Amino acid sequence: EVQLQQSGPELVKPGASVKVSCKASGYSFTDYNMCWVKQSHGKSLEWIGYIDPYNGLTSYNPKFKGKATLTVDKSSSTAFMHLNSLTSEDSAVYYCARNYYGRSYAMDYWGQGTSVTV
Amino acid sequence: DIVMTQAASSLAVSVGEKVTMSCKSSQSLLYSSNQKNYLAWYQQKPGQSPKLLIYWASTRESGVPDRFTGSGSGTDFTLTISSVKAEDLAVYYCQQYYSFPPTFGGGTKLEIK
Amino acid sequence: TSINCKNIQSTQLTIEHLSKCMAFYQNKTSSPVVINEIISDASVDEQELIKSLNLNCNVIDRFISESSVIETQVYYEYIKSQLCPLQVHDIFTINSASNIQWKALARSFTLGVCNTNPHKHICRCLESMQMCTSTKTDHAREMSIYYDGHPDRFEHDMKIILNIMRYIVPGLGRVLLDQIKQTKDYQALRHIQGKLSPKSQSNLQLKGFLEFVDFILGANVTIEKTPQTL
Ligand SMILES: *[C@@H]1O[C@H](CO)[C@@H](O[C@@H]2O[C@H](CO)[C@@H](O[C@@H]3O[C@H](CO[C@H]4O[C@H](CO[C@H]5O[C@H](CO)[C@@H](O)[C@H](O)[C@@H]5O)[C@@H](O)[C@H](O[C@H]5O[C@H](CO)[C@@H](O)[C@H](O)[C@@H]5O)[C@@H]4O)[C@@H](O)[C@H](O[C@H]4O[C@H](CO)[C@@H](O)[C@H](O)[C@@H]4O)[C@@H]3O)[C@H](O)[C@H]2NC(C)=O)[C@H](O)[C@H]1NC(C)=O
Ligand SMILES: *[C@@H]1O[C@H](CO[C@@H]2O[C@@H](C)[C@@H](O)[C@@H](O)[C@@H]2O)[C@@H](O[C@@H]2O[C@H](CO)[C@@H](O)[C@H](O)[C@H]2NC(C)=O)[C@H](O)[C@H]1NC(C)=O
């Protein structure tokens, strides 16, 4: 069907940068944009931002504007999230979820998630 | 921005019983031009990714059982499960996609006894 | 040279040039005129015909809509400007019957970018009448991710804009809007919107709406122009 596979877990010492991959299958990658969600070990879910693969343009939550940077490679249908200057807060599981503009920012298909530990 | 508050951090029910969860919003999530509440319900089973249950606060995604129902307007929304099954034990979240940025609730853990 | 709305040269039949003969563009808010003096400089035959029509401010836009002769439509539009100054400029007064009708239309229509992002300023301006002062550059930073590279969405909102403006400027303006819609030549819309912005400074909601139009016309998107009937 529709599948979003994410990179394996990451252990990073504080101060370094980590990059997470999201491979899309089963749909046209440029018709739906990519949303990234930080879920701490607590129940909290936080919306980081989204990126239109066709535009390449991005929109970030003001909270994560400095911490995160989203890019895409349309050829391999892959979306990348980059986190720089990791700290104690940045330890969390990061999710990659599809979104369609016709249904505002509601996410139907979610990736597996990637645990980033600092 | 908008803050979403959910009634119960966790609630315990027996199998077969009818359960109701609440999601309240700081600001009205209803856009009057299209008359659609910008609100969604997710189910996150243990150690798994959140699954989309309901969008627009009423419409439920394809593949979501008939048991799950969602209703509400303005700032007050509720998710209702008809006859709970064992498979349903999970953490249920709600999301507002009205204002920037999209914000989530604390989550409501359905525990089964 | 210069365009006479009573006598329009054949080469002047483009949206840009015809735009100059809209009734509001004549800057007559006052001194409504009896029709006989309005047509005093015209052929006696055309004078007897126009007099025979029994025109008044209520049906004149409909007579303009019925005629298939663009020169006749422009002429009747000039007649409308001299005969019906208050009806012509009724839309720019911040509270008017026409302005209320247009407001109802705007609240009723849902733009695509509004459906995706109801928090945006333009949506607030059309629905709840707030946030109506925003530059095209703010609109660019906000909504460029929504429109750029999406012809379908761009045309979707563009048709809606064309309906709302369809009810701003009846008569010749409506004909020009229908022509733009038919030909997908959406950049020509400037010629209407550009002539409407400085007229609209007293009305904040109208000013903000037209500003949004200015932004959206500049979206990075390629459109193909279907053939013209003129
Ligand atoms: C009823 O009143 C209206 C007033 O609302 C009046 O309309 C004006 O008429 C005057 C005189 O006829 C026009 O003045 C001319 O302006 C020429 C330059 O115009 C260009 O730039 C305009 C300004 O753009 C700036 O500002 C905008 C915001 O407004 C901003 O986005 C930009 O940053 C930009 O810097 C612009 O409005 C104008 O656009 C017109 O034309 C386009 C294309 O046709 C159309 O889409 C628009 O809707 C608008 O109609 C245009 O882009 C100027 O060059 C010109 O010529 C003089 O200078 C040259 C120099 O070589 C000389 O050769 C020449 O002989 C002149 O001396 C003249 O000054 C003014 O533009 C009109 N305004 C509008 C909005 O149309 C009507 O005429 C009145 N009706 C009557 C009298 O019957
Ligand atoms: C205006 O658009 C062009 C092309 O469209 C954009 O770029 C592509 C990625 C396309 O798939 C769409 O998502 C975008 O809307 C912009 O870029 C150039 O496009 C050509 C293709 O013709 C490409 O080969 C170049 O590398 C691109 N970059 C250049 C020429 O610098 C262009 O940059 C856009 N302009 C603005 C101001 O946004």
Side-chain angles (χ1 to χ4, degrees):
Chain A
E1 319 193 10
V2 175
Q3 191 173 358
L4 296 185
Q5 184 186 338
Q6 295 188 209
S7 66
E10 307 269 9
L11 172 63
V12 183
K13 301 306 176 184
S17 64
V18 62
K19 202 176 179 182
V20 184
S21 77
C22 193
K23 197 167 49 193
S25 54
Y27 69 95
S28 45
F29 177 64
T30 56
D31 297 347
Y32 303 75
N33 49 36
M34 273 314 196
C35 301
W36 298 88
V37 160
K38 178 170 97 176
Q39 186 189 220
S40 197
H41 190 62
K43 313 165 72 76
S44 73
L45 277 167
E46 278 168 314
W47 196 85
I48 295 176
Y50 85 101
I51 164 179
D52 188 330
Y54 207 107
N55 296 40
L57 302 172
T58 55
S59 171
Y60 302 105
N61 187 325
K63 295 276 187 294
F64 306 104
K65 275 197 173 297
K67 279 85 165 181
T69 300
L70 314 176
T71 60
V72 279
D73 167 36
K74 318 176 189 181
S75 180
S76 56
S77 296
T78 310
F80 310 96
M81 180 191 73
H82 172 280
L83 302 173
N84 42 37
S85 307
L86 294 177
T87 69
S88 305
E89 287 177 359
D90 293 344
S91 294
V93 169
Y94 291 86
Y95 285 100
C96 171
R98 179 178 85 162
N99 159 42
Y100 185 58
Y101 80 104
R103 302 167 172 81
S104 167
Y105 302 144
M107 309 154 198
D108 48 353
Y109 285 74
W110 292 60
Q112 66 203 48
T114 301
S115 79
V116 173
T117 305
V118 174
Chain B
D1 47 48
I2 293 184
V3 163
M4 306 303 274
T5 36
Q6 297 208 229
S9 170
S10 64
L11 37 80
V13 299
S14 185
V15 176
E17 292 174 2
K18 179 173 193 175
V19 72
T20 281
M21 294 160 289
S22 289
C23 178
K24 289 182 181 174
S25 173
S26 310
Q27 179 184 351
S28 177
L29 304 180
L30 172 53
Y31 185 36
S32 73
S33 298
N34 59 18
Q35 290 292 308
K36 281 181 265 185
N37 289 284
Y38 288 74
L39 184 281
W41 286 94
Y42 296 107
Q43 170 189 76
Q44 183 184 37
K45 289 168 176 296
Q48 200 196 310
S49 308
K51 178 168 194 313
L52 175 59
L53 279 184
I54 287 183
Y55 64 104
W56 290 137
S58 70
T59 311
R60 82 184 73 97
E61 191 77 10
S62 158
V64 177
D66 188 28
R67 299 183 283 98
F68 295 98
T69 324
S71 64
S73 209
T75 58
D76 292 26
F77 300 100
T78 49
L79 180 66
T80 303
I81 302 180
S82 308
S83 74
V84 172
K85 293 177 66 177
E87 49 179 0
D88 287 343
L89 163 67
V91 192
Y92 292 92
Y93 300 95
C94 56
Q95 169 200 10
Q96 64 91 18
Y97 33 85
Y98 192 86
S99 74
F100 195 81
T103 58
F104 291 72
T108 297
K109 187 166 184 286
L110 198 164
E111 298 173 2
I112 295 188
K113 60 180 187 184
Chain C
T1 53
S2 299
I3 176 172
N4 190 346
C5 303
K6 295 199 168 192
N7 196 289
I8 186 167
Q9 282 298 39
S10 303
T11 302
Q12 295 183 308
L13 293 192
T14 64
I15 310 277
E16 173 184 19
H17 289 142
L18 292 173
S19 170
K20 307 167 68 188
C21 276
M22 280 183 296
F24 79 92
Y25 208 57
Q26 288 314 115
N27 308 319
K28 188 82 152 186
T29 93
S30 68
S31 310
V33 184
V34 185
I35 179 189
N36 302 17
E37 164 132 359
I38 307 182
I39 63 176
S40 63
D41 59 336
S43 45
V44 184
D45 301 331
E46 193 174 15
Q47 290 204 358
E48 198 72 21
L49 178 74
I50 287 187
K51 177 135 184 174
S52 175
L53 291 187
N54 295 324
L55 289 166
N56 41 318
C57 285
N58 302 350
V59 303
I60 179 166
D61 279 326
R62 305 193 178 265
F63 278 86
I64 298 184
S65 64
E66 295 300 334
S67 185
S68 300
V69 181
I70 183 68
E71 304 78 346
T72 296
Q73 284 187 320
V74 172
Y75 190 26
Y76 290 175
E77 171 92 354
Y78 175 100
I79 291 179
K80 184 184 65 175
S81 71
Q82 298 297 2
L83 177 64
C84 311
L86 307 176
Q87 334 274 345
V88 158
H89 279 75
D90 203 354
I91 189 67
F92 300 157
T93 299
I94 186 168
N95 189 13
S96 322
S98 62
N99 202 267
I100 288 184
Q101 154 197 97
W102 172 81
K103 283 184 176 189
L105 233 71
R107 149 163 178 159
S108 293
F109 281 108
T110 306
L111 279 61
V113 65
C114 282
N115 183 49
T116 308
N117 319 313
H119 59 80
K120 295 283 181 176
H121 289 289
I122 173 64
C123 310
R124 279 305 144 265
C125 182
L126 266 44
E127 182 201 18
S128 45
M129 217 167 56
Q130 307 170 326
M131 317 284 198
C132 287
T133 50
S134 295
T135 67
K136 82 172 176 192
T137 60
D138 294 313
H139 294 147
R141 62 139 297 257
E142 285 197 314
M143 291 173 285
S144 290
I145 183 169
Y146 177 85
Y147 287 108
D148 291 332
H150 296 299
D152 49 345
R153 309 173 191 185
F154 173 80
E155 289 195 47
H156 174 272
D157 286 3
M158 205 52 55
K159 291 188 189 306
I160 299 184
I161 296 178
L162 293 184
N163 284 295
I164 309 193
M165 302 198 61
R166 199 178 179 273
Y167 266 100
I168 301 176
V169 294
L172 183 57
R174 179 175 292 115
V175 172
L176 293 156
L177 298 163
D178 290 346
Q179 188 74 7
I180 291 175
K181 185 177 306 174
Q182 176 203 165
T183 57
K184 298 283 178 173
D185 178 13
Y186 296 122
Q187 304 313 309
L189 178 55
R190 302 272 185 198
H191 305 322
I192 304 232
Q193 84 93 14
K195 299 186 177 63
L196 279 167
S197 297
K199 319 291 295 183
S200 308
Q201 289 310 96
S202 296
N203 192 183
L204 281 180
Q205 186 176 24
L206 188 51
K207 175 173 71 78
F209 173 80
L210 297 156
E211 184 86 26
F212 177 85
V213 175
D214 189 358
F215 147 73
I216 192 174
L217 295 175
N220 191 359
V221 49
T222 294
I223 242 59
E224 54 203 357
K225 300 155 182 44
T226 68
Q228 58 169 321
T229 58
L230 293 165

Short mmCIF file of all heavy atoms in Angstrom, two decimals, chain B residues 27-62:
data_model
loop_
_atom_site.label_atom_id
_atom_site.label_comp_id
_atom_site.label_asym_id
_atom_site.label_seq_id
_atom_site.Cartn_x
_atom_site.Cartn_y
_atom_site.Cartn_z
N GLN B 27 -9.18 28.04 21.44
CA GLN B 27 -9.84 28.88 20.46
C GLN B 27 -10.79 28.02 19.63
O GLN B 27 -10.55 26.82 19.44
CB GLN B 27 -8.79 29.55 19.56
CG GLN B 27 -9.31 30.46 18.46
CD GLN B 27 -8.20 30.99 17.58
OE1 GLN B 27 -7.01 30.82 17.89
NE2 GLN B 27 -8.56 31.62 16.47
N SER B 28 -11.87 28.62 19.15
CA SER B 28 -12.81 27.88 18.32
C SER B 28 -12.11 27.39 17.07
O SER B 28 -11.40 28.15 16.40
CB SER B 28 -14.01 28.75 17.95
OG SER B 28 -14.89 28.04 17.08
N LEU B 29 -12.31 26.11 16.74
CA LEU B 29 -11.67 25.47 15.61
C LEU B 29 -12.57 25.41 14.37
O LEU B 29 -12.26 24.69 13.42
CB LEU B 29 -11.24 24.06 16.00
CG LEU B 29 -10.33 23.98 17.23
CD1 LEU B 29 -9.97 22.55 17.54
CD2 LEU B 29 -9.08 24.81 17.01
N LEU B 30 -13.67 26.16 14.37
CA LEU B 30 -14.66 26.11 13.31
C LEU B 30 -14.45 27.28 12.36
O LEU B 30 -14.53 28.44 12.77
CB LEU B 30 -16.07 26.13 13.89
CG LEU B 30 -17.25 26.26 12.93
CD1 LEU B 30 -17.16 25.21 11.86
CD2 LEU B 30 -18.53 26.11 13.71
N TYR B 31 -14.19 26.97 11.09
CA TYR B 31 -14.08 27.97 10.04
C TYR B 31 -15.45 28.11 9.38
O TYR B 31 -15.94 27.15 8.78
CB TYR B 31 -13.00 27.56 9.04
CG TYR B 31 -12.68 28.55 7.94
CD1 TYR B 31 -12.69 29.92 8.18
CD2 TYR B 31 -12.32 28.11 6.67
CE1 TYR B 31 -12.38 30.82 7.18
CE2 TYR B 31 -12.01 29.01 5.67
CZ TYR B 31 -12.04 30.36 5.92
OH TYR B 31 -11.72 31.25 4.91
N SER B 32 -16.06 29.29 9.49
CA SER B 32 -17.46 29.43 9.11
C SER B 32 -17.66 29.39 7.60
O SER B 32 -18.76 29.04 7.15
CB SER B 32 -18.03 30.74 9.64
OG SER B 32 -17.53 31.85 8.91
N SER B 33 -16.64 29.72 6.81
CA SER B 33 -16.81 29.73 5.36
C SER B 33 -17.07 28.33 4.82
O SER B 33 -17.95 28.14 3.97
CB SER B 33 -15.59 30.36 4.69
OG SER B 33 -15.42 31.71 5.10
N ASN B 34 -16.33 27.33 5.30
CA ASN B 34 -16.55 25.96 4.88
C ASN B 34 -17.28 25.13 5.94
O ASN B 34 -17.57 23.96 5.70
CB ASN B 34 -15.23 25.29 4.50
CG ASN B 34 -14.23 25.27 5.64
OD1 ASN B 34 -14.59 25.44 6.80
ND2 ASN B 34 -12.97 25.05 5.31
N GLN B 35 -17.54 25.71 7.11
CA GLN B 35 -18.28 25.05 8.19
C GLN B 35 -17.63 23.72 8.57
O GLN B 35 -18.31 22.71 8.78
CB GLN B 35 -19.75 24.84 7.79
CG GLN B 35 -20.59 26.11 7.71
CD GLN B 35 -20.83 26.78 9.06
OE1 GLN B 35 -21.28 26.14 10.01
NE2 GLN B 35 -20.54 28.08 9.14
N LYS B 36 -16.30 23.71 8.68
CA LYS B 36 -15.55 22.50 9.02
C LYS B 36 -14.69 22.76 10.24
O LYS B 36 -13.96 23.76 10.30
CB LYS B 36 -14.68 22.03 7.85
CG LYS B 36 -15.44 21.26 6.78
CD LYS B 36 -14.54 20.79 5.64
CE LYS B 36 -14.53 21.77 4.47
NZ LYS B 36 -13.76 21.30 3.27
N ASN B 37 -14.80 21.88 11.23
CA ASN B 37 -13.97 21.95 12.43
C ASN B 37 -12.60 21.34 12.14
O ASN B 37 -12.51 20.17 11.77
CB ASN B 37 -14.64 21.23 13.59
CG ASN B 37 -15.85 21.98 14.12
OD1 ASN B 37 -15.71 22.97 14.83
ND2 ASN B 37 -17.04 21.49 13.79
N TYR B 38 -11.55 22.12 12.34
CA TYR B 38 -10.19 21.67 12.04
C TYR B 38 -9.66 20.92 13.25
O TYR B 38 -8.99 21.47 14.12
CB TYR B 38 -9.31 22.85 11.66
CG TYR B 38 -9.64 23.42 10.29
CD1 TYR B 38 -10.78 24.18 10.09
CD2 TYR B 38 -8.82 23.17 9.19
CE1 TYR B 38 -11.08 24.69 8.85
CE2 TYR B 38 -9.12 23.68 7.95
CZ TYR B 38 -10.26 24.43 7.78
OH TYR B 38 -10.58 24.95 6.55
N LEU B 39 -9.94 19.61 13.29
CA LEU B 39 -9.70 18.79 14.47
C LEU B 39 -9.57 17.34 14.02
O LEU B 39 -10.24 16.92 13.08
CB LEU B 39 -10.84 18.96 15.47
CG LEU B 39 -10.88 18.30 16.86
CD1 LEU B 39 -11.28 16.84 16.77
CD2 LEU B 39 -9.56 18.48 17.60
N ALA B 40 -8.73 16.59 14.72
CA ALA B 40 -8.44 15.22 14.31
C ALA B 40 -8.16 14.37 15.53
O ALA B 40 -7.72 14.87 16.57
CB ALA B 40 -7.27 15.15 13.33
N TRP B 41 -8.38 13.07 15.38
CA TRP B 41 -8.21 12.09 16.43
C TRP B 41 -7.28 10.99 15.96
O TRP B 41 -7.49 10.42 14.88
CB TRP B 41 -9.55 11.50 16.84
CG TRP B 41 -10.39 12.44 17.64
CD1 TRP B 41 -11.36 13.28 17.17
CD2 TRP B 41 -10.35 12.62 19.06
NE1 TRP B 41 -11.92 13.98 18.22
CE2 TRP B 41 -11.32 13.59 19.38
CE3 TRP B 41 -9.59 12.05 20.08
CZ2 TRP B 41 -11.54 14.01 20.69
CZ3 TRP B 41 -9.81 12.47 21.37
CH2 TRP B 41 -10.77 13.44 21.67
N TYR B 42 -6.27 10.69 16.78
CA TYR B 42 -5.25 9.69 16.51
C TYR B 42 -5.28 8.61 17.58
O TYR B 42 -5.56 8.89 18.76
CB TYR B 42 -3.85 10.32 16.49
CG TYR B 42 -3.65 11.31 15.37
CD1 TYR B 42 -3.61 12.67 15.63
CD2 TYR B 42 -3.50 10.89 14.06
CE1 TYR B 42 -3.43 13.59 14.61
CE2 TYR B 42 -3.32 11.80 13.03
CZ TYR B 42 -3.29 13.15 13.31
OH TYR B 42 -3.11 14.05 12.30
N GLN B 43 -4.96 7.39 17.17
CA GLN B 43 -4.79 6.24 18.06
C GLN B 43 -3.34 5.78 17.97
O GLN B 43 -2.86 5.47 16.87
CB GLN B 43 -5.74 5.11 17.66
CG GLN B 43 -5.48 3.79 18.35
CD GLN B 43 -6.31 2.68 17.75
OE1 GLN B 43 -6.00 2.17 16.67
NE2 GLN B 43 -7.38 2.30 18.44
N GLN B 44 -2.66 5.74 19.10
CA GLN B 44 -1.27 5.28 19.15
C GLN B 44 -1.19 4.08 20.08
O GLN B 44 -1.23 4.22 21.31
CB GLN B 44 -0.33 6.40 19.61
CG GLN B 44 1.14 6.00 19.60
CD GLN B 44 2.05 7.08 20.16
OE1 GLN B 44 1.69 7.78 21.11
NE2 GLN B 44 3.23 7.23 19.57
N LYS B 45 -1.08 2.89 19.49
CA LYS B 45 -0.93 1.66 20.23
C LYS B 45 0.45 1.62 20.88
O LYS B 45 1.34 2.39 20.51
CB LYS B 45 -1.14 0.46 19.31
CG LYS B 45 -2.59 0.26 18.87
CD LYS B 45 -2.67 -0.74 17.72
CE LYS B 45 -4.11 -1.03 17.32
NZ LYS B 45 -4.86 -1.67 18.42
N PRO B 46 0.66 0.74 21.87
CA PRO B 46 1.94 0.74 22.60
C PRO B 46 3.14 0.54 21.68
O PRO B 46 3.20 -0.42 20.91
CB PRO B 46 1.78 -0.43 23.57
CG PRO B 46 0.32 -0.53 23.80
CD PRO B 46 -0.31 -0.19 22.48
N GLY B 47 4.10 1.45 21.78
CA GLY B 47 5.35 1.35 21.04
C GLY B 47 5.19 1.43 19.54
O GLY B 47 6.00 0.85 18.80
N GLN B 48 4.18 2.13 19.06
CA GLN B 48 3.87 2.20 17.64
C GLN B 48 3.67 3.66 17.24
O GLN B 48 3.71 4.57 18.08
CB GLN B 48 2.63 1.35 17.35
CG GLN B 48 2.43 0.92 15.93
CD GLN B 48 1.01 0.43 15.69
OE1 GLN B 48 0.50 -0.40 16.45
NE2 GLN B 48 0.36 0.97 14.67
N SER B 49 3.47 3.89 15.94
CA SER B 49 3.21 5.22 15.41
C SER B 49 1.73 5.58 15.55
O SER B 49 0.87 4.70 15.53
CB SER B 49 3.63 5.30 13.95
OG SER B 49 4.96 4.85 13.77
N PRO B 50 1.42 6.86 15.69
CA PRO B 50 0.01 7.28 15.75
C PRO B 50 -0.71 6.98 14.44
O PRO B 50 -0.21 7.27 13.35
CB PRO B 50 0.09 8.78 16.02
CG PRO B 50 1.43 9.00 16.62
CD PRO B 50 2.33 7.99 15.97
N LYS B 51 -1.89 6.38 14.56
CA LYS B 51 -2.76 6.11 13.42
C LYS B 51 -3.87 7.14 13.38
O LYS B 51 -4.44 7.51 14.42
CB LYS B 51 -3.36 4.71 13.54
CG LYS B 51 -4.34 4.33 12.42
CD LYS B 51 -4.66 2.84 12.43
CE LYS B 51 -5.35 2.41 11.13
NZ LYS B 51 -6.45 3.32 10.73
N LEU B 52 -4.18 7.63 12.18
CA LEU B 52 -5.24 8.62 12.05
C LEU B 52 -6.59 7.92 12.20
O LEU B 52 -6.90 6.98 11.46
CB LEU B 52 -5.16 9.33 10.70
CG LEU B 52 -6.28 10.32 10.37
CD1 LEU B 52 -6.36 11.43 11.39
CD2 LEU B 52 -6.09 10.90 8.99
N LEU B 53 -7.38 8.38 13.17
CA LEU B 53 -8.72 7.84 13.38
C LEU B 53 -9.78 8.70 12.69
O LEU B 53 -10.53 8.20 11.85
CB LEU B 53 -9.04 7.74 14.88
CG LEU B 53 -8.48 6.53 15.61
CD1 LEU B 53 -8.97 6.56 17.04
CD2 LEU B 53 -8.93 5.27 14.90
N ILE B 54 -9.86 9.97 13.06
CA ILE B 54 -10.92 10.84 12.56
C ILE B 54 -10.33 12.17 12.11
O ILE B 54 -9.44 12.73 12.77
CB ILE B 54 -12.00 11.03 13.64
CG1 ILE B 54 -12.82 9.74 13.78
CG2 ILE B 54 -12.90 12.23 13.34
CD1 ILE B 54 -13.96 9.82 14.77
N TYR B 55 -10.80 12.68 10.97
CA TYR B 55 -10.44 14.02 10.53
C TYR B 55 -11.70 14.85 10.33
O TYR B 55 -12.80 14.31 10.16
CB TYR B 55 -9.59 13.98 9.25
CG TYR B 55 -10.25 13.43 8.01
CD1 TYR B 55 -10.70 14.27 7.00
CD2 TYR B 55 -10.39 12.06 7.83
CE1 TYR B 55 -11.29 13.77 5.86
CE2 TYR B 55 -10.99 11.55 6.69
CZ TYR B 55 -11.43 12.41 5.71
OH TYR B 55 -12.03 11.91 4.57
N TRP B 56 -11.54 16.17 10.42
CA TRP B 56 -12.62 17.15 10.38
C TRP B 56 -13.54 17.06 11.58
O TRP B 56 -14.61 17.67 11.57
CB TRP B 56 -13.46 17.05 9.10
CG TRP B 56 -12.78 17.47 7.82
CD1 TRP B 56 -12.83 16.83 6.62
CD2 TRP B 56 -11.97 18.64 7.61
NE1 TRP B 56 -12.10 17.51 5.68
CE2 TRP B 56 -11.56 18.63 6.27
CE3 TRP B 56 -11.55 19.69 8.43
CZ2 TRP B 56 -10.76 19.62 5.72
CZ3 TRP B 56 -10.75 20.67 7.89
CH2 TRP B 56 -10.36 20.63 6.55
N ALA B 57 -13.18 16.26 12.58
CA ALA B 57 -13.88 15.99 13.84
C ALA B 57 -15.05 15.02 13.67
O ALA B 57 -15.55 14.51 14.68
CB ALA B 57 -14.38 17.26 14.55
N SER B 58 -15.48 14.72 12.45
CA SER B 58 -16.62 13.84 12.22
C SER B 58 -16.25 12.69 11.29
O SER B 58 -16.50 11.53 11.60
CB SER B 58 -17.80 14.63 11.65
OG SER B 58 -17.54 15.03 10.31
N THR B 59 -15.70 13.02 10.11
CA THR B 59 -15.32 12.00 9.14
C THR B 59 -14.22 11.11 9.71
O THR B 59 -13.24 11.60 10.27
CB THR B 59 -14.83 12.65 7.85
OG1 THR B 59 -15.76 13.65 7.41
CG2 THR B 59 -14.64 11.61 6.76
N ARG B 60 -14.37 9.80 9.53
CA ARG B 60 -13.35 8.85 9.97
C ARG B 60 -12.64 8.28 8.75
O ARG B 60 -13.26 8.04 7.71
CB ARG B 60 -13.94 7.74 10.84
CG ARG B 60 -14.59 6.57 10.11
CD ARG B 60 -15.22 5.60 11.10
NE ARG B 60 -16.45 6.12 11.70
CZ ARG B 60 -17.67 5.84 11.27
NH1 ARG B 60 -17.84 5.03 10.23
NH2 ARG B 60 -18.73 6.35 11.89
N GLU B 61 -11.33 8.07 8.89
CA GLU B 61 -10.51 7.62 7.77
C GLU B 61 -10.95 6.22 7.33
O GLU B 61 -11.58 5.47 8.09
CB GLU B 61 -9.03 7.62 8.16
CG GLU B 61 -8.03 7.41 7.01
CD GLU B 61 -7.83 8.66 6.16
OE1 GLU B 61 -8.30 9.74 6.55
OE2 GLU B 61 -7.17 8.56 5.10
N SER B 62 -10.65 5.89 6.08
CA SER B 62 -10.96 4.57 5.58
C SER B 62 -10.20 3.52 6.38
O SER B 62 -9.04 3.71 6.73
CB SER B 62 -10.60 4.46 4.10
OG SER B 62 -10.42 3.11 3.72
#
